Amino acid sequence: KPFTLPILTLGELTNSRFPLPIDVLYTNPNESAIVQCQNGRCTLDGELQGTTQLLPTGICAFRGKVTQQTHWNMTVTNLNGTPFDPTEDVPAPLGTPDFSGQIYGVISQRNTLPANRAHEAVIATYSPKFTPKLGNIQFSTWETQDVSSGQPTKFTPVGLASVDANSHFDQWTLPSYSGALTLNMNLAPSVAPVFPGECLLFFRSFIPLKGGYGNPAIDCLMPQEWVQHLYQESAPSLSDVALVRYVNPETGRTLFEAKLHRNGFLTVARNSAGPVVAPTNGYFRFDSWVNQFYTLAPM
Amino acid sequence: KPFTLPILTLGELTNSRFPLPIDVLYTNPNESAIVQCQNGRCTLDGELQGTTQLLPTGICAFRGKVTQQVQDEHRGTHWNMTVTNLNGTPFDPTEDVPAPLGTPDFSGQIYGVISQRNTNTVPGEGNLPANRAHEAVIATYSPKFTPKLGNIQFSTWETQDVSSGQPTKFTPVGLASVDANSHFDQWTLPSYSGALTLNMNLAPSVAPVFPGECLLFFRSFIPLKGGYGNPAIDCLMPQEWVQHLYQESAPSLSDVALVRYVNPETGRTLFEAKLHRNGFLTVARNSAGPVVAPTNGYFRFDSWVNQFYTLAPM
Ligand SMILES: C[C@@H]1O[C@@H](OCCn2ccnn2)[C@@H](O)[C@H](O)[C@@H]1O
């Protein structure tokens, strides 16, 4: 069964690590951190890994119930409402955020015609109280009282609360899904170029801010639509590296080429940082299976 | 090119009319309103229609700029914002669409968050722009809701912290209210150019054309900022079907495709349905309410038939 990628321009793709459209392609060769994100992780033959799931509405979302108290403790279930089983071979409930920061969104409740309420809320994923693998998290509100206990609760993500020093935003620092003294488990593996002159290529989105100064961004290894496509196709991988070309359909010319690695990420032969300037109509097309000694044409 | 549907369970599908997961399949044979939604509209050979676009993040979203604070009789602080296309290019009112793609397609008080990132930077803050976000409501039935003209109005609880002339984003979250005075009706279209003007370039209405059949919907429940209610949004096809049909572009070999809802574990057909060329489903059922089916079920394409095919009763 032949391997394929969808035909979608950058303006038709969304981020797999936060609910945002893709804004630009991006490189940063001098990144010193280990890249080991857990959302947007899928092998080329269609195996989801980490905390990755298929719903665009599930990325950085939570479902559960508030237990007690401005901060509130919430037990979390699986996104489909079934109880989360901590013994399952996953790092945390699928969809759980995969980075350190103060995530800003809306908590809403519909009581078990029922009464309703919603408020702005913040979830600090670096907090010792952020233990989703144990089945519970904490969120804070500006609202001081009108949050009900024991009623079905939803968290809709919107952006970040802040990116100043005291807010610990770092997109490559994983949360401690079970707490500070416990090791994370069942992680999708780290990714990196394994050839001189190459660097990772990211799909970059800019993320909203509730206040303060800054222009924060979230980089993903593959867009959510690629995760969904690879899962459907389940095409066998015929080598460890696929050669793909970024083409201009109008002119028919290749703008640059890249390696698409079996574990699900891209590298290019580029020695600079920043956005990739390309026509709006461009997209990646599969060319052939190669190996780890293939020399990419410098972009 | 053979016609195909994706292999996705209800728990793997999302709504095409609001950013929500699909909760249940649903029927309502005695519906009196004309069904003519504009999001989630796609022919079986892949032609997007109405205000439909591909991004799940674009459904009921807006991008643009706030111009100034304005007066309005209703409770809150009100603001005018010009809107562009979702990709930032100017919206061209002469394009053959009802409104900018992504525009909401129903009457109601849509609740969400307005956020801004300034274009100018502050050297004292490391050459970085200032930001703000606040809860907001957009009343799609208001005479000031004129997206086809390039501008809309929204209200906030916050009284002052919204800047003029800065890039602005609306992220939808749910409804503000469903009380009588909030005019929620999922089948009543907005007046995209304002009161007393005729909407144009609409995706066509859908209806059964055979005795004993009714429309079948993918239903999601939508959050509420406050008040009583359990509101729902019904779409004709999920967003992942819109995305699949657009990619495949398979020619339609008749006006109706016969599809079966199968339980892959046992391999059995749970019920069958007609998938019409314009992009909607009908079933042979004479009751309203949810379809109770196993969690593993999904629709599978069987064959092209015609409008005189008799479906097996559900
Ligand atoms: C940078 C600011 O951050 C937030 O105010 C926080 C305090 N503050 C006011 C002025 N400087 N700091 C936003 O509410 C503002 O509109 C503004 O963007």
Q: Where are the domains of chain B?
A: 1-58+177-314, 59-176
Residue to substitute from A156, A230, A281, interface B, most B β-carbons within 10 A = A156
Q: Which of B58, B169, B230 sits opposite A114 (nearest CB)?
A: B230
Closest CA to B257 of B234, B278, B274: B274
* 3-state secondary structure at position B110: strand
Q: Give me the CATH code for the A59-161 domain, please.
A: 2.40.30.120
Chain A residues whose CB is inside 8 A of the B235 CB are none
Instruction: Say how far apart CA A169 and CA A235 lie, in whole Å.
Output: 37
CATH value of B1-58+177-314 in 3.90.226.10, 2.40.510.10, 3.40.50.970, 2.60.40.10: 2.40.510.10
The architecture (CATH level 2) of B59-176 comes to Beta Barrel (2.40)
In angstroms, this model's resolution equals 1.8
Å between B173 CA and nearest CA of chain A:
7
Q: Give me the CATH code for the A1-58+162-299 domain, please.
A: 2.40.510.10
Q: Is the CB of A211 under 6 A from ligand 1?
A: yes
Instruction: Say how far apart CA B106 and CA B91 lie, in whole Å.
Output: 21
* 3-state secondary structure at position A269: coil
From which experimental method does this structure derive?
A: X-ray
Instruction: Say how far apart CA A106 and CA A116 lie, in whole Å.
Output: 13
Instruction: Give the angle B289-B206-A13 at the CA atoms, nearest 5°.
Output: 90
Instruction: Say how far apart CA A288 and CA A296 lie, in whole Å.
Output: 13
Report the interhelical angle of B239-248 vs A224-233 (nearest 10°).
70
* 3-state secondary structure at position A53: coil
Instruction: Say how far apart CA B88 and CA B67 lie, in whole Å.
Output: 16
Closest CA to A114 of B23, B26, B221: B221
Q: Is the CB of B131 under 6 A from ligand 1?
A: yes
Do A66 and A149 meet the contact criterion of CB atoms below 8 Å apart?
A: yes
Which string of DSSP letters, residue by residue, matches chain B? ---------GGG-B-SSSS-B--EEEE-TT--S-B--SSS-B-TTS-B-TT--S-GGGTT-EEEEEEEEE--SSSSEEEEEEE--TTSSPP-TTSSSSSSTT---SBSEEEEEEEEE-SS-BGGGTSB-EEEEEEEEEETTSTT-BGGGTEEEEEESSSS---TTSEEEEEEEEES--SGGG--BTTSPP-TT-TT----SPPPPB---STTEEEEEEEEE--BSEEE---EEEESS-HHHHHHHHHH-PPPSSSEEEEEEEETTTTEEEEEEEEETTTEEEEE----EEE---TT-EEEEEEEE-TT--PPP-
Determine the distance separating the centroid of ligand 1 and the alpha carbon of A193, expressed in angstroms: 40
Residue to substitute from B171, B222, B241, interface A, most A β-carbons within 10 A = B171
Q: Whose CA is nearest to atom 11 of ligand 1?
A: A212
